[PDB]
């Protein structure tokens, strides 16, 4: 600690994300306190791919009531790293 490898959570599997695969960019959930500068060092270590323009987004949780008991969803924070051209994906593999 701190280490790049623990910063990531899970890949975001969405139809909107699958379209971004041809854009040479891949969404990943990231810790709320993490900065863009940290994410750039993660891909360079874990994937080894050169990093270009990283985008990061936060989401307020939606309500998910179960009978009487309402409760807010945890705040996810996915990141979008636009990988440089000519770089093999490790996603899905």
């Amino acid at each position: 600690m701190k280490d790049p490898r623990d910063v990531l959570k899970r890949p975001v599997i969405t139809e909107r994300s699958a379209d971004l695969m041809t854009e040479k960019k891949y969404t990943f959930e990231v810790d709320v306190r993490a900065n863009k500068t940290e994410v750039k060092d993660a891909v360079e270590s874990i994937f080894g791919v050169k990093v270009d323009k990283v985008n990061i987004m936060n989401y307020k949780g939606k309500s998910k009531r179960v009978g009487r008991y309402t409760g807010m969803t945890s705040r996810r924070r996915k990141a979008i790293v636009k990988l440089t051209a000519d770089s093999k994906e490790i996603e899905i593999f």
Partner: peptide, 24 residues
Amino acid sequence: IYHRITTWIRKVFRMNSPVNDEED
């Protein structure tokens, strides 16, 4: 589906003009 439902009631008020006149 839970189909939970809730009902709320309130007393409120008020006016009192009262529009009453006489005797004077």
